[PDB]
Design a protein around this ligand. Structure first.
Ligand code: AKG
Ligand code: AKG
Lengths: 212, 214
DNA sequence: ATTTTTATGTATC
DNA sequence: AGCTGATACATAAAAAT
DNA sequence: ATTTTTATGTATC
DNA sequence: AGCTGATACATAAAAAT
């Protein structure tokens, strides 16, 4: 629905391309827009003064984001950094176009609430991950998400279909790459995952998610 | 505020909807319970937890007053069942509209849709804000970040500073920030020695939130 | 094809 | 290397009866 | 009011 | 006690020119 609903928000709405690594919005940018991710993945990050980054969200296809604009009151400015972790296609409705269309087609409000509901549950899902202690468990919990979100079927299990640098992972699970490398290595030795061409394939993903 | 007013008027009959009172410790919903309701927290704090087979718990959300929760219901397409444990970390008071009453009233009074979207939007941001917390490494920083939230969320003014108005056991904290209670004790002890916080009757009073941040 | 920047592996502490 | 978990045990505070 | 279960302080590695 | 961060350096893969 979301995809269909967002198309009709206007002449119709054209998609925007962003190339891998291009910023969808910067800290400071007025929160005047709501987005729908259609193709690709988007990385929501907090950027500390030191230039260092922490990942808050690796949004999956069909995700509503830029949600701070939906809040009424003093015009708010972005505080996270939205970047195209893959090549991505989104819609970028201005906030006032949206508000209008929620009044005219109340069906869009039901569909919108559902998407925000999934965002809350997906983000909580992530808290569960970080709330582990063992960085091996934290990593595995993270991978089991990425399997659910970006994974395609493989002979033995699911291959996480996106290019994940160990650094990118480290930023997502509150660790450092050398730990992420080391740990991923340990999964490889245990024969729980396998990597070819920077693509992590977890075996029996069902069996790992049972351990929680 | 609107939410509160909006939720009041979602009554079964002509009379408004009554609050439900839950005592400290009583479960608002259990894993398995059909997700057929959306809630508004009014007075208190709700602990959303995941309970592993071993009896062990992880806290996902310590929701603050005026929070919308029970949102798996809002997501239709499948009659899903609850997977988290909603419990009153404090004496709480909520509204509990059935999901079909809500859906109807979003179409009839579109004003409530805007107010609902705002509420769920605040949830997303609040939950991310928590990710930021956990995504630290230093458990002292993680703890402090956690407390600075609780100051924003549950804090009332005191002569010395902001008192986080909720009884927090070190265990409860440990579950919230992915640690253990002996670490939480030890760490909180360190704050006490440094004279950055003080605890009376299980209530943590931060003296200068910005001083802790430093 | 020739750099140069990024990603990964391993060891130590 | 340096936290923090694991394990321990004393003792105080809260809950239950 | 007692008793018992839980919470906290502290130590070790 | 033991993970895991900090630091280090080698080396491979990818991007940029
Ligand atoms: O809305 C923002 O500016 C940040 C939060 C966000 O992008 C989202 O999770 O929807
Ligand atoms: O909606 C659920 O059933 C679990 C998550 C939740 O309660 C919420 O955060 O709204």
């Amino acid at each position: 629905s979301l995809l269909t609903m967002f198309r009709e928000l206007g002449l119709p709405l054209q998609i925007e391309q962003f190339e891998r690594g291009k910023t969808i919005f910067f800290p400071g940018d007025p929160a005047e827009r709501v987005y729908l991710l259609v193709k690709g993945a988007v990385k929501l990050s907090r950027v500390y003064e030191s230039g260092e980054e922490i990942t808050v969200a690796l949004l999956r296809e069909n995700s509503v984001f830029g949600v701070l604009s939906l809040l009424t009151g003093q015009r708010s400015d972005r505080f996270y950094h939205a970047v195209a972790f893959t090549p991505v296609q989104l819609f970028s409705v201005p906030i006032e176009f949206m508000q209008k269309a929620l009044i005219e087609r109340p069906e869009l409000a039901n569909v919108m609430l559902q998407g925000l509901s999934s965002r809350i549950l997906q983000t909580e899902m992530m808290i569960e991950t970080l709330a582990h202690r063992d960085m091996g468990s934290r990593l595995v919990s993270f991978l089991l998400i990425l399997c659910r979100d970006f994974g395609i079927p493989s002979p033995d299990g699911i291959t996480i279909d996106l290019k994940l640098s160990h650094q990118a992972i480290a930023e997502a699970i509150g660790s450092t790459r050398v730990t992420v490398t080391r740990l991923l290595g340990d999964l490889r030795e245990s024969k729980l995952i396998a990597i070819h061409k920077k693509r992590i394939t977890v075996f029996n993903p069902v069996a790992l998610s049972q351990q929680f």
